[PDB]
Amino acid sequence: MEDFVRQCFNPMIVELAEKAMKEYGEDPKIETNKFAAICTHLEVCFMYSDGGSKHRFEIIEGRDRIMAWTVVNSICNTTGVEKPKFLPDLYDYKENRFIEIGVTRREVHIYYLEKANKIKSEKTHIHIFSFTGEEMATKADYTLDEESRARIKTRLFTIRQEMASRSLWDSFRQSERA
Ligand SMILES: O=C(O)/C(O)=C/C(=O)C1(Cc2ccc(Cl)cc2)CCN(Cc2ccccc2)CC1
Ligand SMILES: [Mn+2]
Ligand SMILES: [Mn+2]
């Protein structure tokens, strides 16, 4: 599983995931499903940012804390958009809203509710993906076109397939908590 992540995710994603884990005092070499999840979520974040036109999204996920809030506060100032309680993952310049992107090994509707309840926002859009084709976005507005979405859902499927080929999937599938 450690080998699978090192192999299937690019080196910048793997370094970010390491740093995030070590900041909570966890060891990527032992909490390898968490490691994998983090990498997976980051890749989805970047993929999604690339689904727009050229300048459509601002990436927030993947940045250190000071920079991430610098971006967020700067947007809130230059747009009147209200200030989220938690860092989001993206800002959408076209829809003028922050996005929270979830990637779940469970079911999309449950993770959506959990995410909605943790956020406190009538205003941050939430978009959840699974490894088996499901999405659930706020007010059924999936933001990107179906082809962008499909490239994301397919990549997640491919990840799941690759894990299962290495017998990592059962364990990975069962590692996410409420
Ligand atoms: O869950 C997501 O889909 C997500 O994008 C989470 C986040 O960005 C974090 C902020 C957050 C975002 C949304 C919600 Cl509901 C709760 C917290 C900040 C960095 N995160 C860094 C981190 C990841 C894993 C282990 C330690 C730290 C944790 C929560
Ligand atoms: Mn985030
Ligand atoms: Mn997210």
Side-chain angles (χ1 to χ4, degrees), residues 1-53 55-84 86-121 124-150 152-178:
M1 182 58 93
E2 195 191 341
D3 304 57
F4 160 81
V5 170
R6 294 195 193 291
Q7 185 157 348
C8 227
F9 297 94
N10 93 59
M12 11 299 159
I13 285 163
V14 173
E15 180 61 46
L16 275 169
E18 288 184 4
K19 167 198 239 280
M21 293 194 68
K22 296 206 261 174
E23 288 173 348
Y24 288 79
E26 299 153 337
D27 182 346
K29 298 182 149 70
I30 291 141
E31 295 220 339
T32 58
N33 294 315
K34 189 147 181 162
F35 186 26
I38 290 160
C39 290
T40 298
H41 172 259
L42 288 156
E43 185 172 355
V44 171
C45 283
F46 298 135
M47 282 188 80
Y48 206 115
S49 72
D50 292 352
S53 35
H55 300 293
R56 182 167 164 175
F57 302 107
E58 199 59 60
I59 304 188
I60 301 151
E61 185 62 273
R63 293 188 188 270
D64 66 61
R65 283 170 185 77
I66 293 177
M67 206 69 23
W69 285 107
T70 301
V71 172
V72 169
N73 293 332
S74 152
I75 280 150
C76 292
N77 299 318
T78 66
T79 74
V81 158
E82 42 167 9
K83 206 187 127 166
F86 297 90
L87 287 174
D89 288 310
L90 300 178
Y91 185 74
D92 181 339
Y93 288 113
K94 199 220 191 167
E95 294 300 327
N96 288 287
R97 56 187 185 201
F98 287 109
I99 308 172
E100 174 52 44
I101 294 166
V103 170
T104 179
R105 15 227 205 288
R106 288 178 298 157
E107 194 265 337
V108 113
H109 300 87
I110 186 151
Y111 194 55
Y112 182 97
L113 285 169
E114 289 183 5
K115 228 94 175 125
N117 194 70
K118 214 329 186 195
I119 287 324
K120 270 289 131 55
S121 174
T124 298
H125 216 77
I126 303 172
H127 193 154
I128 309 302
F129 296 94
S130 66
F131 293 83
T132 54
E134 294 99 333
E135 0 158 59
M136 163 71 206
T138 304
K139 323 238 76 188
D141 184 346
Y142 292 82
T143 290
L144 296 163
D145 60 29
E146 65 196 358
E147 208 220 300
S148 294
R149 283 142 69 204
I152 302 179
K153 299 170 181 146
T154 289
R155 172 72 183 145
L156 286 164
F157 184 71
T158 303
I159 285 167
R160 177 233 189 275
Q161 291 298 256
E162 193 61 46
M163 282 174 180
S165 101
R166 302 144 122 104
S167 275
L168 292 169
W169 169 255
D170 166 52
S171 185
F172 181 67
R173 186 183 51 85
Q174 289 195 270
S175 61
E176 187 186 299
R177 287 294 177 284

